[PDB]
């Protein structure tokens, strides 16, 4: 089954369709575009009746060839009625937001977070005790780390997620959401964490208020700076080997280039293309133990994107040891596959 033949590109959510004739992705044209076609495209990506809006935007990508729509066709697929074209009647392409995400109301050495600042933050408990966190990306799905749900914890009935709550003493049974499924990455290597990402599904979909909201996943072609201004949060130990924090802290870290994070005085080429370091080589800010899987978000275009998820580290209050996170950008396709293949 191969059905990831449509995608959104970059911060503007430029809908694209794949053409084997040119073996390239071409943005769709806005002329004669049905909005129900946009709804269908959103469903074909794994969105349970989640559709925000479609609008025409002058192409913000770098494609000279487009995909015009044949309105004389009928009862065919999206790729069947789209034909290659080098221009648009209206100088605008299709922009497709398939969900309302990325809006928020606005850890060692990280100031406490206010309610509504990081609504996607999740605290996952195993035995009424917080093990690690995740990220709300959909009323049902959560993005976390694979090393969190290693055996014996790979069964879905151990876990209960507490989203919308910032206090760990107010996370009582009957406040969280039982997890239906836990879908770790098949290519997760425990010895050397490479594809350390995992999912979680809830029996009861989350209701989104100012306190609870999703975080946009990174579409392809997200031009991020070599040192982009990111944010982290979680209930980790504020002191090396300290106890779990009662309150949800936040910190302002900066992405570190992979070419620099693999030097000899650093993790020494241990970082694979599936991982992204963040933090400071000087130190004083990192995601310590207890906030694994936690969000690493970045703001761009008024949207917070799940850049990565906490994976591992060699120490928190240390220099030349930035936090290492999974590259959610790499895993977005697998995430979409697992979200589509729900039920079958």
């Amino acid at each position, epitope marked *: 089954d191969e059905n990831r033949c449509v995608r959104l590109y970059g911060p503007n959510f430029i809908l694209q369709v794949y053409s084997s004739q040119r073996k390239s992705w071409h943005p769709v044209c806005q002329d004669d575009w049905n909005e129900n076609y946009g709804r269908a495209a959103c469903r074909d990506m794994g969105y349970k*009746n989640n559709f925000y809006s479609s609008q025409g935007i002058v192409d913000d990508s770098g494609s000279t060839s487009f995909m015009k729509l044949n309105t004389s066709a009928g009862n065919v697929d999206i790729y069947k009625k789209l034909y290659h074209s080098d221009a648009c009647s209206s100088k605008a392409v299709v922009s497709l937001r398939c969900i309302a995400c990325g809006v928020n109301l606005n850890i060692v050495g990280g100031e406490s977070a206010l309610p509504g600042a990081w609504p996607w933050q999740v605290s996952l408990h195993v035995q009424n005790v917080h093990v690690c966190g995740g990220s709300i990306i959909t009323p049902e799905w959560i993005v976390t780390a694979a090393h969190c749900v290693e055996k014996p914890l790979n069964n879905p009935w151990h876990w209960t997620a507490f989203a919308g709550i910032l206090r760990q003493s107010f996370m009582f049974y009957g406040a969280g959401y039982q997890v239906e499924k836990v879908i770790s990455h098949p290519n997760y290597d425990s010895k050397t964490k490479n594809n350390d990402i995992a999912l979680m599904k809830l029996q009861k979909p989350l209701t989104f208020n100012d306190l609870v909201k999703p975080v946009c996943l990174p579409n392809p072609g997200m031009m991020l700076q070599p040192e982009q201004l990111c944010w982290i949060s979680g209930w980790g130990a504020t002191e090396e080997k300290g106890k779990t924090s009662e309150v949800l802290n936040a910190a302002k870290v900066l992405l570190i280039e992979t070419q620099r994070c693999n030097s000899r005085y650093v993790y020494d080429n241990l970082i694979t293309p599936a991982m992204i370091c963040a933090g400071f080589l000087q130190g004083n800010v990192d995601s310590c133990q207890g906030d694994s899987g936690g969000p690493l978000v970045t703001s761009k275009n008024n949207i917070w994107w799940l850049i990565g998820d906490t994976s591992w580290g060699s120490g928190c209050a240390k220099a030349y040891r930035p936090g290492v996170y999974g590259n959610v950008m790499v895993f977005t396709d697998w995430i979409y596959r697992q979200m589509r293949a729900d039920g079958e």
Partner: antibody
Amino acid sequence: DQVQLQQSGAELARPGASVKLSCKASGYTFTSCGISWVKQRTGQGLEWIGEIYPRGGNTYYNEKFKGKATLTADKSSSTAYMELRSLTSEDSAVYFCARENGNYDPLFAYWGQGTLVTVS
Amino acid sequence: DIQMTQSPSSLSASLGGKVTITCKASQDINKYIAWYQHKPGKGPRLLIHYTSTLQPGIPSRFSGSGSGRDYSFSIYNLEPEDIATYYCLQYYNLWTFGGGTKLEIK
């Protein structure tokens, strides 16, 4: 085979009760397309209730009918359902089950035979 | 919600003549209008989709047209078989029907 969307027979129920209509579909891959429910009233003309997609259960509803209707489907049996709650004096219509041509052609080319729902 | 206002609400037409039923939209639906027949108990039948196409096996005397927010649908040489409550449907954003028009001979 002509794509057939046999609906349940005409039914009646007391006000404030619930009626669960069914529309069994044959002649096409039930999971491939989507099924719509269209209301037909005397004086009020035709109206649109919502859409059910058997592949994943994705549902779309009209503003008026939120809560009043609950679309449902079961892929294995190959038949879709629409549940009406708190039926009242004005919920007496000939509800039509219609299959849209395709996911990229939302045209109601095929329709059910009709199921006159009346409220006591 | 793209509302639609179909007029005239009813028309006593002349057999063997001509008639045109007007439908208008609350948005630009990119000519994604469809026209359905409605026999008293034979279920609706699709006639026109996209303002310019008649579903196969349908009389050529049926034809519609339009653009923007106002659309038209006309049928000439009226026969008894054409007595029906015609509707305009937009499938540009969700689905919406017209008000309907009783096409009764005079």
